[PDB]
């Protein structure tokens, strides 16, 4: 016992207020007043937002207000902005020599302008071709939501072998980015008219083509 339950998904809308819960027992959260709330953007270090049941440190906006009730702490975010879209963890005193963190709440801000994916396709390098290898690179940035499907076409026809596509990750600007690499042989590269990377997003599609260069 003596763990913390933080509901995984809280979402809100701009201007509104969201209340994130952090439920413990009498021995950790109910009994003592040492609770902390950390905000962490994906890829960044955690930042302290609340350092006691209710205390904002120097540099935290007044929007974030902590509270406690019985065995449940609660962080309330007022005047929601896009910047508040992050992972929020709660920590509490579980005893001498024991500090317990929560599961984390992924706060989603609701005002969502859907954005078309920006796609850039790079052909293999001369050095790589001179090393009997080839790799097509398809980079996708600045799209929303983070759900895209990548397809590779050999002149017209799909290629499902040698494809490695990353899982979408949130950028700094709240949009998403992904990469997709197609490993090929120089023979396959120089034996086709053109290769193409297609990115499908919310029904829409973006195609980028690439062809070999010789003289």
């Amino acid at each position: 016992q003596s763990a913390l339950t933080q509901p995984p998904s809280a979402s809100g809308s701009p201007g509104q207020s969201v209340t994130i819960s952090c439920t413990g027992t009498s021995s950790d959260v109910g009994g003592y007043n040492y609770v902390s709330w950390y905000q962490q953007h994906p890829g960044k270090a955690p930042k302290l937002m609340i350092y006691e049941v209710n205390k904002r440190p120097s540099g935290v906006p007044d929007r974030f207000s902590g509270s406690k009730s019985g065995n449940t702490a609660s962080l309330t975010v007022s005047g929601l902005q896009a910047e508040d879209e992050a992972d929020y963890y709660c920590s509490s005193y579980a005893g001498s020599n024991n500090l317990v963190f929560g599961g984390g709440t992924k706060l989603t801000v609701l005002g969502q302008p859907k954005a078309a994916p920006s796609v850039t396709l790079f052909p293999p390098s001369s050095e790589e071709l001179q090393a009997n290898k080839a790799t097509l690179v398809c980079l996708i940035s600045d799209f929303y939501p983070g759900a895209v499907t990548v397809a590779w076409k050999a002149d017209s026809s799909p290629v499902k072998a040698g494809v490695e596509t990353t899982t979408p990750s949130k950028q700094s600007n709240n949009k998403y980015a992904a990469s997709s690499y197609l490993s090929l042989t120089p023979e396959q590269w120089k034996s086709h008219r053109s290769y193409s990377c297609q990115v499908t997003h919310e029904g829409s599609t973006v195609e980028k083509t690439v062809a070999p260069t010789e003289c």
């Binding site: 902390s36 270090a45 302290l48 350092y51």
Partner: peptide, 11 residues
């Protein structure tokens, strides 16, 4: 000790 960690190092 506040049990809130003010400044964090990089990964």
């Amino acid at each position: 000790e506040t049990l809130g960690f003010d400044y964090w190092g990089q990964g």
